[PDB]
Subunit: 375 residues, 5 copies
């Protein structure tokens, strides 16, 4: 009875076009805040933050006022989109194909004219995502809100601290905080300044999954590439091991090409580890080729340079703690004996080249080890 009467009286001559101030020369104060409910998604490749947010807007409407003695029990009223003046506050840096993602709900007005408006929405905002320090990276995503067509002379936007009481923690992003800052800006469009409120959502990535999926595979690849230096050359498998470890690395590069977020803005420090490991694997293949040249050296070819015969077989080697008819028959047997004694000599020469390969092989083992550590 009284709710009906009030609803009929309130709209008499009301104009949703009119900014509802008593004095036209004065600006209308609008308090703007928001409630952060959940960080739905952080799109690194598209540079888009998705959030579930309840916007909070409050203003006084001069015309929507009533004495609650003449309408007993009617302490508030509600108006849908289009029947009440509302601030046209938009998210400036929206990434939504519709640009305005707010779901339009009721404005709640009490008897002194105070208008409350809390539209929810899944908001997409354009956020510059810096993955230089990925996975230990902190992102500052700005949410810039402001009246689109009401400037500072007409709509005095004011900020209130963002609400996080209802926040639901994300399983990948730790909410550091959501500070806000009201600014008064000028635009080439207009001589009048347009205030805005910007909420910076500071997020801290929880790195566990990434440290478990991206870093241990590099240690296992590097380790399996460094086992080539322990594999004997007689096996005939050093190249198989090293080249197959590199093929596995390439497959893991496909995986990394998917798991790791790339935005092309910088060079994630983490990727200097992927590079260190690809270079250690390729250089262990190059050094396995050098060791194989040493091991398979031709005994009838060149002679081992005295230079290397002392650099490796002596110095490095020590540092590694490594160590008539009767006469006709005589000529026939002597040939055989000397043939034997000559292949034996060639086998000894071969044994030094085979030994040098072992020494070079272990030196590379230790050298490659320390290099991994520092990197």
């Amino acid at each position: 009875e009284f709710q009906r009467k009030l609803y009929k009286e309130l709209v008499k001559n009301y104009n949703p076009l009119e900014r509802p101030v008593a004095n036209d020369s004065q600006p209308l104060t609008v308090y703007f805040s928001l409630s952060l409910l959940q960080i739905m998604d952080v799109d690194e490749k598209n540079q888009v933050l998705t959030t579930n947010i309840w916007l909070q807007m409050s203003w006084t409407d001069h015309y929507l006022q009533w004495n609650v003695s003449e309408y007993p029990g009617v302490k508030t009223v509600r108006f849908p989109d289009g029947q009440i003046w509302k601030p046209d506050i938009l998210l400036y840096n929206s990434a939504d194909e519709r640009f305005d993602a707010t779901f339009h709900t009721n404005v709640l007005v009490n008897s002194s004219g105070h208008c409350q408006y809390l539209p929810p929405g899944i908001f997409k905002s354009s956020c510059y995502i810096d993955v230089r320090w990925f996975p230990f990276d902190v992102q500052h995503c700005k949410l810039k809100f402001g009246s689109w067509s009401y400037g500072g002379w007409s709509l005095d936007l004011q900020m209130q601290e963002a609400d996080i009481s209802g926040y639901i923690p994300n399983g990948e992003w730790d909410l550091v905080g959501i500070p806000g800052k009201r600014s008064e800006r000028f635009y080439e469009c207009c001589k009048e300044p347009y205030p805005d409120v910007t909420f910076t959502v500071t997020m801290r990535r929880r790195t566990l999954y990434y440290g478990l999926n991206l870093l241990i595979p590099c240690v296992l690849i590097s380790a399996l590439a460094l086992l080539v230096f322990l594999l004997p050359a007689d096996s005939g498998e050093k190249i198989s091991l090293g080249i197959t470890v590199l093929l596995s690395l390439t497959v893991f590069m496909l995986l990394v090409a998917e798991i790791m977020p790339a935005t092309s803005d910088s060079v994630p420090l983490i990727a200097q580890y992927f590079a260190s490991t690809m270079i250690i694997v390729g250089l262990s293949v190059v050094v396995t080729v050098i060791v194989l040249q040493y091991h398979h050296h031709d005994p009838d070819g060149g002679k081992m340079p005295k230079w290397t015969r002392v650099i490796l077989l002596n110095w490095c080697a020590w540092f590694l703690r490594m160590k008539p008819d009767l006469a006709k028959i005589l000529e026939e047997v002597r040939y055989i004996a000397n043939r034997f004694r000559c292949q034996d000599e060639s086998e000894a020469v071969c044994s030094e080249w085979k030994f040098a390969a072992c020494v070079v092989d272990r030196l590379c083992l230790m050298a490659f080890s320390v290099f991994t550590i520092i990197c």
Copy 2:
């Protein structure tokens, strides 16, 4: 004739803004339930439950009442969106880009004013999906509904048991149950409390497909990695087998990277099996390198430590139940004979190193076997 007359009389002075109570100071009771029809999708990566649901809302409208003797045959009427007051009940934890997924249908009103409203819809809700015990995991997805702008003083939400009579079983998720609980909450926005009804959909994953696609490949990989310990060293293929099994493991890691749902919140126990198998494969490659060092040992290098000559060739070995001119011609032949007798000695020394490799090879076979069992 009477349907027309009733439809004309009912809207006379009706106001869809008015909460349709007789006494304004009193709250309006709204019974809220839902019918679960189908669980369409459980998005683990986006943390979104998709369901086909029929919402059920019922209230009494004081103005929509008629005597069915003055309108014979007209026992009910129907009103579309915008011509009747309706509760503004939303899904709070919506993940829909539109936020309100309900398809708006007719409100059915009978002659005493009872309003029934069963809007259908494909509802997306944000659900925390815990895959710690995947594939034997149970998910509790909350559906929180409540009036957006009507608080507890105006709209007394009441719950009724959810309907599952029409449910269609999912081929991947067993519906344990959908209990509900009405709560009365406070929000920083407002001093008035806002009741809500929350339906918790408890689902139990049917693990067959996952146990068939993800677990047997790990047993086949582990088994093929443990066949390296039975492959003879003379073959010259132990490294080829082990390293290729690891390459196949990496490809299977791509597959697992797709089939398995990862949400980065925890560490699926199942993944401790993927880790156990990758470690068994890498350690069988390391132990194959050690066996190859033993087998390919240089007979003219070091001597087999008595320590190991007893630890392996004796103890482990037993535990495994393993086992003038004429004189010038004489000198020539003696050299040849002694050369033979010296290579033979070196061949025997080599045979112990080749034997030790076999013993170490089988010990690793049994050791690796028991390790798999416990893990």
Copy 3:
């Protein structure tokens, strides 16, 4: 002139809320059919059938009647959405995020009041897709239509045979038929029953592409895995061949993981062939390891069990149709001669182990062959 006059007269006092019957106590008959134009997509993973359909609804409207002598030439009229009463017939088992996919068109009404309404639309419906017999699988997808808010007492839904004259054959699904069945159901919501019409679209998959992309690769993999039993052991490549065939199998498992539709409801019989082939490949690798143990057996180790010396070298082998100073010099030469005669003996022992490997190798060839056939 007459079209204008008729359009003005027809809407005078018309109410799109009124079910357009003359007697209010009687139900309104609505004939419902559809024209199937094209089966756009069969989503096995999401369990969604997409179709292009023209719905067909016909009823009589008591008020939309005119004498075509007073409006010469005006034999029909057309009304858009919102200006005429229309049945609210929805697809119950919709999978569309909007839930109602019908494109709203004109209702065509002739002079006796007969209303025709053929809205087109791209309809998504939830269909249980059973791939047990994939690719020779037949799917029965239900399309359940019914009035949402008009029960059997108000709207007497009646069915007419579906139209397929305009159907455009799909390149992957053969339309067996689209039978319909009108049912009268009860729901927990309501004591009144709600009739519905359900069209079951029966589809038969055209299996060519699948038989060409999924089955021949398994025959080629199995064949290349069985060529290991013909490869000699001296080559030193049996393991390379078998393990690389298994790696190729894993890559083909990625392909199958994409081409093959999996819905987790059952276990496609076809997949018992994928399992048979993976098991034949892994068991040919295990049997190649056994053959290699036989071939590389140590002549100074154990002795070939008489048991196997008769089981293989005799029985299986036959079944396969397989087959002073002078004296000092004497001692020196005798040693050499006996050394030769002793390695020769050891070479013969080795030749039986090498022979046994060949016999086991071919037995496995034939055994593995018959196993493939039956599977």
Copy 4:
């Protein structure tokens, strides 16, 4: 002043429901054409053509006429959706989830009543895409337009040649032409016939990218598979080369599985080349196994069939232009000498088997070469 007056006079009693003809018994002529601006996408897998098109509709409206002496300067007027009668022309074979993709713009009307209406839109149409001759394939995609609810007695659709002056060439599809044909069809719905205009867009694929990404890899794979026949058997790598070439082929099959469009309707002739190359690779692996059996033949096993000793070592070989105490000491030395003379004989027998392998190896080289050519 005059524009305002005309706009007020024109809508007086206007009815957007009225087909705007002077005589009601007569049909209204509507000229229909379109401007093709760009072929946006040809979806082979979903069988959907996407185009940017400007529809062109023209008709005369009897009521929208004015004398341009009483409204000086006002030579045309414009009306938005809903304030003027418009033809309800739809794309019958739409693949758009909304079914009507036209963006609704102004109708331009001049002083004699001629209505022009050029709505733009991104149109999705269902097109049967035949990839039998891919990449040299020509597609005929139909665009069927017609009035949905106005039959031939009410709306006389007429065609005009499609406009391509503004067309922007596609980088993948050459526009052969867009002929049109007006048809008068009957439907089971209705006894009245419904005319339609169908524009067939004929496209010719520009095959460069496909010939560069899909065909050369098959020539390189086939060539690398045929280098196995030139690799010596002593290398011990023929199987490694052939089986790894097949593994690379499988990876390339993944690539082809993505680049190549498959619609399951036919069997792209191009794919007979993919099959020819997979079969040449598998058969070169089979023939490498046969060559290896020849090369590794056991000298103490069977004897080379005279049959093959003449077929290969002679005929094919020629066609390829290929080619007391003292006595005790005597017995000891004679044994050694005869042992030598016996292994030598066995080495010669081995050399024929090794020679035969070379002859078979080259015959397969030439045979496989000619086979590639014809295929």
Copy 5:
């Protein structure tokens, strides 16, 4: 008070259909510019530029004028969509499924009637993307705006320089500039010309990420393929190395198939490097097969052509700075001695073929090196 009065007076007799000019014969000038805020995405495969833009339109409305002495404090007013005449300026080359992506906001009008309208929007435009010089490629994407239904006689479009003060730099595309050009075009539709304003957005790709992900892998592949020429032939692994490097190349071709943008219009010069590297790898495999034929040559087969014995062993080799009873016993020993002396001769012949392989091996090393440089 005055805002209300003005809003009531301004709409009295206003007609949003009327182009708001004082003289009807004259055209209305509309200034059109835009503010570029962010280049959201450059879709090379779909040929679509996505941008966040604020359109800027300004015109004078003759009717929306008031004296600001009779409405003190009211210096501007605002009108939403549908209550004021607005230019119907569309993006001609839109790629949006809705075709008009502009979010409709208020028109701001001051007291002399000047209308300002700055609708924001996420605009999709069809842009021809030329990747011939990728990654050092510059794209010119046109944005063609114009009145759809107002020709040059009614709406005199005029251009103003685009605004970039608010631009936010993209992490992948450097904004060179956004020049504009107003054109007056004719269309087959209409005899009247339709002016348009086209803004060409010139972008310069920042190539770092691409040079790091696509080019270094080709240098590492080419280098690992050229290490086969340093690997000794005795290792028995040249083919394993080369063929596995090619397999890794194929995997990298999958990666390139994803990272690299292909539009099929041209042939990216960069891809001539991918071709150079695939050809160097395949030709090093072919030359490794030739070297293996040389190394494994049969000493009892043909003789080394004098031609090659001088071309390689001399010329190239030098350029590379590379280098009774008693008598019966005599016959027995002589045989053995001569057998030895004959295998030795055959070993020397083999050593020249093994030497020639080394010379050919290094020549190919240097030849392949210079070829890489030039390419």
